[PDB]
Design a binder for this molecule. Structure first.
Ligand code: HEM
Ligand code: HEM
Ligand code: HEM
Lengths: 727, 727, 309, 83
């Protein structure tokens, strides 16, 4: 045949390229020389296509893939067409059950490398030499929605990493907030059922804004700490690259001398912390529901690889009871002001998968998968997690051999006496299938614990008590961490939290649930309670106004590490800018703009009111990437408007909406020359206003002004003015 | 631990060795140099064990595989023990459903090779050149019983061969008789349910001798032909090596010029045809329920490779309507007297599997798996089979990617647009997942039909008729094939047929069923029915005595290729002999005996009343293989008793009973010198008789008379004496 | 067509009859009047048959159940025959995985009744009153063999009882000897793999007489006690009725005041103890592989009901 | 069979016919109905061949396909009328 175009423009270049410049593609067609041990190891299973014949799964060549075998050309389909029945049979069985929680997620390959040897504190082999590189596969996700729900919802986010080490698979299964909603694993099914779609009508999708979620929260004050996080702007990340990651529980690091050290795991983003604002996140679930999945893929195809540093909070065993909270209570954080995070290695994500289903959907992560050098604790939530991850996977991936699915296979050796099970791949030649045996001289054999390459042994903790079903009294305090989190937010972050609580509480149909939640907020902080109650048209009683606030945490009244914006770290590399074109761009402006952009690693998208192209004033042909309505302001970080024939787009409803939307959402805006005339549509004062960059032309002082606001993420001083702007 | 004996006798030599000499083992350790393209391609999934550490499935080394993790050495088991839970979880999910029919089966690897080119009549690549070697995987089985049922029951046998060809998998799924019980696939669940264990109490296992089977037969006369084969000695073969193989249905062979020829497939045993006699077979299901599986395996380990010749019965399309019966009716055979079998090539089975579960239990055969060069026909039993094998494999093997389990994968290339499904192994890199596509330039591509490597195209047969649920009038004759079969048996085979019917019908509880069956037998042949009637105490009515017999089949009144023994084809190689020792065997007898046997390729089993060793008269030390009770006469083909201290065993009940049981089952018996005292135990005249070899010492003709009788398989002239003899 | 004989000899009398005198049948047609509370609650799903039309599972009457739909009498089968595909689809999916261990077993319904109140030692409701009856469901089995293996092999026997009590289901899942082969659950897969058919060829069925089992026994002396029991005549009972039953583990009984008492459970057969001899038992796996199953069904049909203390 | 787990999906409460359904089909994952019929095949004399086939008729009869006329060769081809 040869249905492909002459010019070969149906295929993308195998080189780093900017978002939207080319069609995206399977990772190994796009970046064939990006290798790692896990990625080379998958070459036994990759399948090509070009130059091969079309066949059945048995290897038989198909002559006509357009028709069914029939008795006469207008006749009945014949049962003997095995070719049709095979093709329809595979199609009929394509789906497998989605994950019970965290079903919506996006993944990529990469590697980890430590900064130094950690042999003094752990015997884990992957942390033992700064030159030992460890292949990894990371999946980012939401919690509540199904596989087809939208990415920029308000929810907690999952951050799971599989380490393919030389001593076994180690999975670090975390979240993007430092604590969880509940204390004991026995309440997980109650909590998940409350936040998920209600059982009679299966509404709502991807949202906690409903009666059952808020009923459960108001009757279980242990959940309030994680609720403050979710209601904050932490709940709507701008990207998986710009959010923090946490293991949440306290684990143990075990060294070669046998000493145990308590640890909490942390992931710190090299691109900085950044979130959207609620109206923008919400509208983005309709304009581009695949926003986070798309921007991670394209970031990797552009070479803006997501980078994170691994960090440890370390507390010696003798200090277990130094804080006024329990170290095993997963609803309690460890303030970095009390115990700093030691930066210990870095992770880079530099390759997209080849097939979403084979690699992302079939991947299995489990927190119980640790390696010698690590160990658990008695945290009641982690303790119950150990049961569930293997159990769930028997039904989701079809049997006990899920470790033989290529993405899950260890890279190191695995030999034991386990046999059979659905879809067994490995063919054992061992004459023995039990131990002790003499017929194979007892191989494979057990290995004693040791400093390196030894068998797993659990840390010999002392256990003392009765068999009981009871919560520890030290876990009984629910308001001081939420209060330290409130006081560590800047003022605009505190306003975002209040609007988060108000918007969700307004969707609760039973008014008595609204009031009970509000009563709980009064125990954290009065200002906060008063604010949410003003929006719900509820009045605080006498009793509620005299409630004594909770105590501070170990003398602390605030910790700037809990805010997203208190201490700036925003980086502009990998951000995107929309450039509104008119039918005769002043080439002088464009060029100044594109070259300032490219020096800071900022991408640009050229938008017009139609597709195809437009020509500048000097005859340069500018191709259009998208239209104004097709790539809304929601999808970009800042908006620039060059000079030229402004008359061309000055009366265009969408081009004006573009500016009002981006202005409402606190994004930097730049207008040169007669583009300044757009100030009338967003009603800006005459002298000027911070956040609006303007000049006679696109000069270098003009771009430094634009790039400087962009490093600060959003224009926080504008909040006050956006109340009276209709968009 | 290092538990093997130093002397290394825990492991068998990697060379051909006689049955029982050494412990049996996985194929790649017993015969590491027996190779083929299929065996070689499985090397990617094989796993060793020697010199490796014992690990979890994630690769973590295990320090203690004897204990669970508890709180205190007498404490409760902890939930955090992920090593225990993984181990027990895999164990708990080992089983998969067994095959709905043919659950019990034994398999092996081999190769096929054509004798000459068949390009004149078919364009199937595997039959086109005498130097093309095609690797095969074969499974032999019973029908009714579960996977743990016994081997030597009375039943049809399956014979399935998977040909790993260069243009796709070809599965020839046959049976050991040339016809099946029913005409249309629509009745398969009805026929299968009648023969299987009755639904209230799930009895009986591996047997057709119960009420529902005979009820179904007496109401459906189409079953009579195959019922005659199952009640004959064809139903209890001596070994999978000594039975015939048949495709049953008429298929089509299509050449390069597009011409179609009708074909019936045949497998001819090169070791000839042999069967057991009923009381031996039934007893053998208790003393060794795995006798066929064991014999198959041991024959390959010793080098007696099962060899079969593939043969074709060829009928030109113009002869479709030339016979008394319909070619598309599977209850009718094509007599070799009318249409000779053309011997076309040979299959040799030379290596056992490594792991039964992985290669045997998971293999999937299907008659719909054909290649260009072949095609189907309108046989209604074959038509409904095409639907069933793909459907059943979806739940047995867990999903539509059953072709990715290692034993089922083709060795030739396979590429298509099918994606996902449970247990997906292949990672596709094709950017497109549909056709026609321009994004991958339409690859993979359809391929036109041609003489070699072309696409599959169905033979364009003419269909004309209305949509009807009706049986063809030409399918309506049920008695002449059964009669043709009956008249071709030898007289002693007719007697075994009578006894099979009498025995089976004696187990039918409702007497009216026995009477209707007998009636049906009177339509086939009067002598047959009078004989069955007298064993059940029934009298034929005067009307039954005058039923007119059915016609000849195209003028034939007998066809000798339908008998097992009319035209003898015995081969003594691979048969086995029992030698009963005493504490002082005449070593001159023993050396003449063992050297004659080795010269013909016959194995010996040295038996005694205890295990260990015996010292011969010249001081030679003999290792004992098994006791008289441990390896009964049911397991050997003939008995030799040598001279020596005969008083050691003259009074042992087991040694005597050993000669009475073999004598009863018509096997040859040889007595040297004073071992002749044993003649009184079996009531043999002084004069002697055919079947009893006797001499002063074990020398010259002694062994040659013995081996002549062994080539004749059983001593049919003794039938008359066995009715007395309490054995 | 194809109907019953005029004399009605196709059907069994619904009264106690001796083994072999009549055809065996489903319990509810054999003993309509035998009831307990579990048997009565199963009435919702029992399905009859006399006087009804043959249908698909969607309830459409079938006109012709002897043939496939085809283009002409000698033509090809059509894809649109949904009656044909429903029938063959259900058949193709009849089987489910057999039990990992104890795949071969035979079951029956009955009831349990206490002799006296046991509330001084336990607050278990089913044991608190002599006049309170508990419906039971019991399953006897072998250990090693598959579901189609033989009954009278040398092996341990399982004795599992489901009690449908008023405060929940209680399962007392035991064996016919008072100890097991091993001490820790961590070694279960190792012991079961050694006793089951060897992995390269899947031999032998329902027998411990092979190399891997004795290998394991010789290296793990903890197994010797139950190996003694298995090699005795306890390994080959005459019937499920003539064997003892045990819970093996020490369990605990808790009364109303919170006091605990250790307990081991026993079942005592009122027909007494009796076993076969080996030669008999081995040969009986060939002459009738279904002897213990047959014997249990037939004893209940004859009125020789299995009873245990 | 895979979405709903086996061949007894018609026993799932929402899918059940409200009219009677009797046949010789048995077993399969999650079988709810407990069949008392002594036969599980037809024809049978042990249950006097019940449940039985019903001939076609104006009402309450068995299903029979309309006897459309079929003519032509076995082809994998699109009709020219569809083009
Ligand atoms: C600290 C609290 C928890 C955290 C940080 C957490 C994190 C996660 C993450 C990130 C995933 C998705 C992994 C992937 O992308 O495939 C996940 C899945 C899952 N989690 Fe957890 N989870 C928590 C609590 C629990 C609890 C308490 C349970 C049950 C006791 C649980 C059961 C599950 C299950 C069943 C899955 C689906 C796994 C699969 O299908 O592969 N989680 N969890
Ligand atoms: C000429 C008549 C037939 C012959 C010679 C035959 C032969 C065989 C053999 C040898 C096997 C076992 C394959 C193995 O070793 O794994 C088998 C399996 C099977 N047969 Fe047939 N059969 C016949 C008729 C039918 C019919 C009419 C149907 C259904 C319409 C049917 C359905 C099946 C099924 C469902 C299996 C199990 C396949 C699997 O689980 O992979 N057979 N047959
Ligand atoms: C005192 C020791 C044991 C006794 C008396 C015992 C008894 C039994 C019995 C009587 C059955 C069959 C129940 C039925 O009729 O369905 C059974 C099945 C089973 N046993 Fe045990 N067993 C023991 C030890 C173990 C151990 C240590 C394990 C695993 C660690 C285990 C796992 C199983 C499993 C998985 C089944 C199948 C259950 C099913 O499929 O429903 N058994 N056992």
């Amino acid at each position: 045949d040869s249905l492909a175009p002459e010019d070969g423009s149906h295929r993308p270049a195998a080189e780093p390229t900017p978002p939207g410049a080319q069609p995206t593609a399977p990772g190994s067609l796009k970046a064939p020389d990006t290798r790692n041990e896990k990625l080379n190891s998958l070459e036994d299973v990759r399948k090509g296509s070009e130059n091969y014949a079309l066949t059945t799964n048995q290897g038989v060549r198909i002559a006509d893939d357009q028709n069914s075998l029939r008795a006469g050309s207008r006749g009945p389909t014949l049962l003997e067409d095995f070719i049709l029945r095979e093709k329809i049979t595979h199609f009929d069985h394509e789906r497998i059950p989605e994950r019970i929680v965290h079903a919506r997620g996006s993944a990529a390959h990469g590697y980890f490398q430590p900064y130094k040897s950690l042999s003094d504190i752990t015997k884990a082999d992957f942390l033992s030499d700064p030159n030992k590189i460890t292949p990894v596969f990371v999946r980012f996700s939401t919690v509540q929605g199904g596989a087809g729900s939208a990415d920029t919802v308000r929810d907690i986010r999952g951050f799971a990493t599989k380490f393919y080490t030389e001593e076994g698979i180690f999975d670090l299964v975390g979240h993007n907030t430092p604590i969880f909603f509940i204390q004991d694993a026995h309440k997980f099914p109650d909590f998940v059922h409350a936040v998920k779609p209600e059982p009679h009508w299966a509404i709502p999708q991807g949202q906690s804004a409903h009666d059952t979620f808020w009923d459960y929260v108001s009757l279980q004050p242990e959940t309030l700490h994680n609720v403050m996080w979710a209601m904050s702007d932490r709940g709507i990340p701008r990207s998986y690259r710009t959010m923090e990651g946490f293991g949440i529980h306290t684990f143990r690091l075990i060294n070669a001398e046998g000493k145990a050290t308590f640890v909490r795991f942390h992931w710190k983003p090299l691109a900085g912390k950044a979130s959207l604002v609620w109206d923008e996140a919400q509208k983005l679930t309709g304009r581009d529901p695949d926003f986070h999945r798309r921007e991670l893929w394209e970031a990797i195809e552009a070479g803006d690889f997501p980078e994170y540093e691994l960090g440890f909070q370390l507390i010696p065993e003798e200090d277990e009871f130094k804080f006024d909270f329990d170290l095993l209570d997963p609803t309690k954080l460890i303030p970095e002001e009390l115990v700093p995070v030691q930066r210990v290695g870095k992770m880079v994500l530099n390759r997209n998968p080849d097939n979403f289903f084979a690699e992302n959907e079939q991947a299995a992560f489990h927190p119980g998968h640790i390696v010698p050098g690590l160990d658990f604790t008695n945290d009641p939530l982690l303790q119950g997690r150990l049961f569930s991850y293997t159990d769930t996977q028997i039904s989701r991936l079809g049997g006990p051999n899920f470790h033989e699915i290529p993405i899950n296979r260890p890279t190191c050796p695995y030999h034991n006496f386990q046999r059979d099970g659905m879809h067994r791949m490995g063919i054992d030649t061992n004459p023995a299938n039990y131990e002790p045996n003499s017929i194979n001289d007892n191989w494979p054999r057990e290995t004693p614990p040791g400093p390196k390459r030894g068998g797993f042994e659990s840390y010999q903790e002392r256990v003392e008590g009765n068999k009981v079903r009871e919560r520890s009294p030290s876990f009984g305090e629910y308001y001081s961490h939420p209060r330290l989190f409130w006081l560590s937010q800047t003022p605009f972050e505190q306003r975002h939290i209040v609007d988060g609580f108000s918007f969700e509480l307004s969707k609760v149909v039973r008014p008595y649930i609204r009031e009970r939640v509000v009563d709980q907020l009064a125990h954290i902080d009065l200002t906060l309670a008063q604010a949410v109650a003003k929006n719900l048209g509820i009045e605080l009683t006498d009793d509620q106004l005299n409630i004594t606030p909770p105590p501070d945490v170990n003398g602390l009244k605030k910790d700037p590490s809990l805010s997203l914006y208190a201490i700036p770290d925003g980086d502009v590399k990998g951000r995107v800018v929309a450039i509104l074109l008119n039918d005769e761009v002043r080439s002088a402006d464009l060029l100044a703009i594109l070259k300032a952009l490219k020096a800071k690693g900022v991408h640009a998208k050229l938008l017009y009111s139609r597709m195809g192209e437009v020509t500048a004033d000097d005859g340069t042909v500018l191709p259009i990437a998208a239209t104004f309505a097709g790539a809304p302001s929601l999808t970009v970080d800042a908006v620039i408007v060059p000079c030229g024939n402004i008359a061309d787009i000055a009366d265009n409803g969408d081009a004006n909406y573009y500016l009002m939307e981006a202005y409402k959402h606190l994004k930097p805006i730049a207008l040169a020359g007669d583009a300044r005339k757009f100030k009338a549509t967003i009603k800006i004062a005459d002298q000027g206003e911070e956040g609006i960059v303007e000049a006679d032309s696109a000069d270098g002082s003009f771009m430094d002004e634009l790039l400087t606001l962009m490093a600060a993420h959003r224009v926080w001083s504008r909040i006050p003015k956006i109340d009276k702007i209709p968009a």
